[PDB]
Amino acid sequence: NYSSLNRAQLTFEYLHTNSTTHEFLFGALAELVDNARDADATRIDIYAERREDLRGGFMLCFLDDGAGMDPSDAASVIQFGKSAKRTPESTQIGQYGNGLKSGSMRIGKDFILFTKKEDTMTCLFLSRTFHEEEGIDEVIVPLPTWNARTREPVTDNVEKFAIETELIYKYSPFRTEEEVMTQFMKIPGDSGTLVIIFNLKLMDNGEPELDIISNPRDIQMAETSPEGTKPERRSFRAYAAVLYIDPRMRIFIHGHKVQTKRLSCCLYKPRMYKYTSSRFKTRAEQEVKKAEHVARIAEEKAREAESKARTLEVRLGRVMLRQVQNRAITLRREADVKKRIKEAKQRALKEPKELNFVFGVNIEHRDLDGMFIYNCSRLIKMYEKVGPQLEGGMACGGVVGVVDVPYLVLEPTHNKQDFADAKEYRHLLRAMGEHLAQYWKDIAIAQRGIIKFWDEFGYLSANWNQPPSSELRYKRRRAMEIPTTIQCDLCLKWRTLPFQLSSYPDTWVCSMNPDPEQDRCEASEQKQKVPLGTFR
Amino acid sequence: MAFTNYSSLNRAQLTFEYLHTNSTTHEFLFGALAELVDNARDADATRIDIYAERREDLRGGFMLCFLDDGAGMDPSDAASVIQFGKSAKRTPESTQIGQYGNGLKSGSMRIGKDFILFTKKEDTMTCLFLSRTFHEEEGIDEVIVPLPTWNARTREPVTDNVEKFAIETELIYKYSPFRTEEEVMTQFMKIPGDSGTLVIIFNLKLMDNGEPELDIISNPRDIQMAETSPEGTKPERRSFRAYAAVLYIDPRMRIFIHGHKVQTKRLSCCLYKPRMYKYTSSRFKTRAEQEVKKAEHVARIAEEKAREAESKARTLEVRLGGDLTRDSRVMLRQVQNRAITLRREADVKKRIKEAKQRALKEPKELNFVFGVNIEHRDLDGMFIYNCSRLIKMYEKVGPQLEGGMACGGVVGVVDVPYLVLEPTHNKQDFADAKEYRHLLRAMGEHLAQYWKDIAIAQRGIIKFWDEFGYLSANWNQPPSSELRYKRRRAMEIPTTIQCDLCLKWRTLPFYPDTWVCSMNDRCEASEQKQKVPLGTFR
Ligand SMILES: Nc1ncnc2c1ncn2[C@@H]1O[C@H](COP(=O)(O)OP(=O)(O)NP(=O)(O)O)[C@@H](O)[C@H]1O
Ligand SMILES: Nc1ncnc2c1ncn2[C@@H]1O[C@H](COP(=O)(O)OP(=O)(O)NP(=O)(O)O)[C@@H](O)[C@H]1O
Ligand SMILES: [Mg+2]
Ligand SMILES: [Mg+2]
Ligand SMILES: [Zn+2]
Ligand SMILES: [Zn+2]
């Protein structure tokens, strides 16, 4: 029993320390998007609610129709490091038990979250305003729960519940129980979550860092954009569109749909190269050696306990007989379950241990090139130049590369904007650069003449940065090379259209497609067939 | 200042897995080691020894030890180590590097699974033991930390709870590298002064081939990354000896690696024709003004309260003119002493305010220094320090962002105060990207002015580099090693060296172990400052 020993604890200032991980402000917003995706949301709305009395003049709201949280799920939010998603073979993005706290506290001073699941709905209120005004150096968090159907409090301590709600009514944007219930009612289904960040951070001139005015359909960085500034680093609509390699969840900003995309579907002559990863193989082999030791120990424990149970039965020829017998039963089921996981890791070990590099030419935007590196579907690095692109030449200029890296090979840094194992990441970039050179040889556009290739798509200007010509002949020349893809708003499937779109998307559903083969939500989804190239 | 009793409410808590989460901030492994070096400098150490202790029974084969002779920690200071976010350093316009209440924990847990720290101060010695091995083995999901303290002279336990002390020490003997009290005391004996700290990180992380990430074998005087170094690899990204040498803009603390002194340096003193440009910072001035206004308010309130108590002491004394009772005597003394206390406090706040007002009138400028790296022209770009600690190195700006020879070879240095920029969580970037980008743009413009001011076009560029021994066509290749060319570069950059005794920096007119002023020539010849000529921008 360790009850007298010191525990590590979190203090108020740590909320700030943790938030300084996000020098890229959109990567703080991405944490909350990730959480909606991981909760199996089919939709997230990211929108502003104007509030001239709050710092920055609006609250930033994230509303999803995902699985929601029950009261114990909600309470584990403030157990830093706790992540039910951190399970073997987990393909959730969440793993570190931190992102909502680091991201929200980068964006604003305070947040209030509303969540509903089955018959409960819970509010979690993180108010740094409260801690400052009342001199609190711990991190104290109101967490009231109500019954979702009757709106009665669900609490084991009515005095505590009264203090919690009084704090919410005093310090949150919502000053009455009615106003709080109004927020719960914005979650219209049986489950979902609404996260509201408020008292947003200001620049030195008193304006918020997030600009929702310049383009009312977007969330932009409030800073001047130089010449080669990437759209994804100043427009959240642009960043959200490529945040996942395999978008399904629909994203809306200020009520306007984001045209999410699969980068490999947006490129000229996409080709895929399979890269055998020694790291992937070694780590899978070690995860097996470990599972087989874990199953071995459990079996010896179960075998001892069963032996003692049998001997005690014959000796007794009671109460204690069942402590021994059931202990044997439980160790045996423990041993069997670990043997099954050992076997499952052995089976997976035989699968190919390969990373799939995909390359194609960004003919619409030659200057937006380099590698996009995803980690368990989540974008980590964008526009990373490799191989010949690291020279001052036109070789491999315009080429976009995409790869999805599993956690066994790389895990992210604390801010999910870099990779924690720099040595192995640098190795990956060299491997990607070698394959990029092979892609470039393979499509041979440099053997035939690289300037004349770009001329054909209408790059009249001498500066590498300006867009290709917008006259009609060059528009159609470019468009002919890139299929038109679109997601159904009802069934979430990805479709191709046999014509070109005119221009911010509106609602589209399968039955609007003139293609008789994709004409109904019940028609099965066609997969991109990216052709395979060969290294060396 | 709480409205009610909040003891029933939920607190946020730290769990075991967060130690790992926190450590993933350090993708640059040397940045995790730098956290511990920063703590030693902040504790006013005159020396830190970073060394390996071979232990074939522990993961990675050795423990990494950080031994300093700084101010150490008493038991309450040690307990606050594990209050994440708590930092007594976080004070107005601080010149300590620490401010976030995290670096020891993020850095140590990047490097290894476990650490044990020994520290001495005044009459106490304390051990702090962070054992992820213990947590895994016993299934602990909180973060539980043994923190025993002994009397430094008698070695008797200093504790409020002898049962807790026995549990704490037995955890250390079970899970740490030191399995008896005697072995622990041997570690305290390595702190030979009245104060200091020894941090030992062990069960080091391994690469897939089973070897540690840190290579202490290839060069037994260094700590290197166990990785191949391709062509464009900077020394400070592969050699901890190289990194440590430039980690601080104004080195004082001596650094030893495996017992061998690091030749720390001031980058601005290693360059050809250094020039300084002053850049006015509006944020620096605005923020310093707000800090003065806060101190003015604090002083004014304290003066009001002191005058109130002083008035009451005067009027109460007259009201008790004829009164000889013990009651009236004790109550008059109570208010008289309260007036004395508040007057002393008011006079302290006044002095604090007046010091801040005087500091406010100093120029609120950043100092950019530029020079040509004629010894290694490929090692160029900007070195950006923050409260004297290196954050960004080799950052190319201005003309250097083009293809060309313009500003090739130029190194720039700037020390940014905390009022202007603060660092990211891993102290390897800046938290305010917008303002950092503004600073880079300004540095690039001043760089272009520097290149005009030294006017290499006048003598010609090709011939400039040829004269210092760069006859080869390639940019990446080192300059000639002929005697003529070594001396020609040597006349342009005076050799400086630090005295091992007094820590002063001195200049020599023209070794690996030690050097002192009398080898030049006495330690209290006042330290001479290089005057860097002033340029103007536009
Ligand atoms: N939108 C949401 N819907 C449902 N559950 C959520 C949502 N946001 C947060 N959660 C829950 O809150 C927990 C903590 O979230 P967070 O702090 O982001 O850590 P994490 O997602 O588990 N790991 P990471 O994001 O990698 O640090 C999650 O594990 C979920 O259980
Ligand atoms: N070598 C040391 N000598 C003396 N005190 C030390 C030493 N190392 C750590 N400490 C103490 O431990 C505290 C916590 O260290 P740390 O976790 O590094 O946070 P910090 O230094 O205060 N700020 P930061 O490094 O920016 O996160 C410090 O504030 C000191 O009080
Ligand atoms: Mg998360
Ligand atoms: Mg520190
Ligand atoms: Zn459909
Ligand atoms: Zn000296």
Residue numbers in the entry:
A (entry chain A): 5 to 321, 329 to 514, 519 to 551
B (entry chain B): 1 to 510, 519 to 528, 534 to 551
Study authors write:
We obtained crystals of human MORC2(1–603) in the presence of a molar excess of AMPPNP. The overall architecture of the crystallized MORC2 fragment bound to AMPPNP is an almost symmetric, parallel homodimer resembling the letter M. A 2778 Å2 surface from each monomer is buried at the dimer interface. One AMPPNP molecule, stabilized by an octahedrally coordinated Mg2+ ion, is bound in the active site of both protomers. In the wild-type MORC2 structure, the ATP lid (residues 82–103) is in the closed conformation in both protomers, leaving only a narrow channel between the bound AMPPNP and the solvent. Residues in the lid form a significant part of the dimer interface, with Ile82, Phe84, Arg90, Tyr100, and Asn102-forming hydrogen bonds and hydrophobic contacts with residues 12–24 of the other protomer. Notably, the β-sheet in the transducer-like domain contains an 80-amino acid antiparallel coiled-coil insertion, CC1 (residues 282–361), which forms a 6-nm projection emerging from the ATPase module. A tetrahedrally coordinated zinc atom carried over from the purification was observed bound to the CW domain. The orientation of the CW domain relative to the ATPase module differs by approximately 180˚ in the MORC2 and MORC3 structures, with the degenerate histone-binding site of the MORC2 CW domain facing toward the ATPase module rather than toward solvent. The CW domain binds an array of arginine residues in the transducer-like domain: conserved residue Trp505, providing the ‘right wall’ of the methyl-lysine-coordinating aromatic cage, forms a cation–π interaction with the sidechain of Arg266.
Microrchidia CW-type zinc finger proteins (MORCs) are a family of transcriptional regulators conserved in eukaryotes. We recently showed that human MORC2 is necessary, in conjunction with the human silencing hub (HUSH), for silencing of transgenes integrated at chromatin loci with histone H3 trimethylated at lysine 9 H3K9me3. MORC2 is a 1032-amino acid protein predicted to contain several functional domains including an N-terminal GHKL-type ATPase module with a coiled-coil insertion (CC1).
